[PDB]
Amino acid sequence: GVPTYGAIILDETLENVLLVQGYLAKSGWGFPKGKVNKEEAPHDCAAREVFEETGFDIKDYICKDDYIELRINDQLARLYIIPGIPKDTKFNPKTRREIRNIEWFSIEKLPCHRNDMTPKSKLGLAPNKFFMAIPFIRPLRDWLSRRFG
Numbered sequence: 001g002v003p004t005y006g007a008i009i010l011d012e013t014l015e016n017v018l019l020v021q022g023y024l025a026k027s028g029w030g031f032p033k034g035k036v037n038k039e040e041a042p043h044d045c046a047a048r049e050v051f052e053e054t055g056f057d058i059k060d061y062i063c064k065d066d067y068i069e070l071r072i073n074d075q076l077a078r079l080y081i082i083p084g085i086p087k088d089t090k091f092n093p094k095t096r097r098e099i100r101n102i103e104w105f106s107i108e109k110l111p112c113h114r115n116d117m118t119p120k121s122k123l124g125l126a127p128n129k130f131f132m133a134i135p136f137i138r139p140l141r142d143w144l145s146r147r148f149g
């Protein structure tokens with residue numbers, strides 16, 4: 001699978017994170033990210049995908065060692081951590097053809113797992129609109145505790 005790169009953008013309080021909402025298969029909320037092009041460096045892919053999806057340029061804010069990386073079904077996803085972005089920043093995707101909406105969410109209110117269906121004696125997980133974000137939430141919380149306190 002082709003690696004994806006993007007960002008976890010936080011506000012000044014460190015309470016809130018910026019998620020984007022796509023369409024169709026990407027219909028829920030997730031961190032802005034996308035597939036690396038041929039010969040493109042990771043930091044440049046992250047800036048491009050984030051700029052294409054939010055209209056915000058992270059290039060001057062990326063720190064090389066500050067990211068969360070996960071391997072999900074043998075595809076690697078790396079999100080650079082970008083704190084301190086004012087909550088009154090105007091975000092606008094390049095085209096509403098890929099991005100429905102862009103919103104701040106409270107980190108403490110986001111789920112860090114989906115719910116089973118043990119109530120119904122049925123296997124699997126209930127749908128959750130944050131399914132794309134969820135795998136990064138606990139590692140983010142842990143990373144913020146270590147790097148800030």
Ligand SMILES: Cc1nnc(NC2CCCCCC2)o1
Binds near residue numbers: 034053098
């Ligand atoms: C698959 C997958 N997992 N996370 C994402 N991120 C997208 C979120 C919704 C908006 C479209 C572009 C970024 O896609």
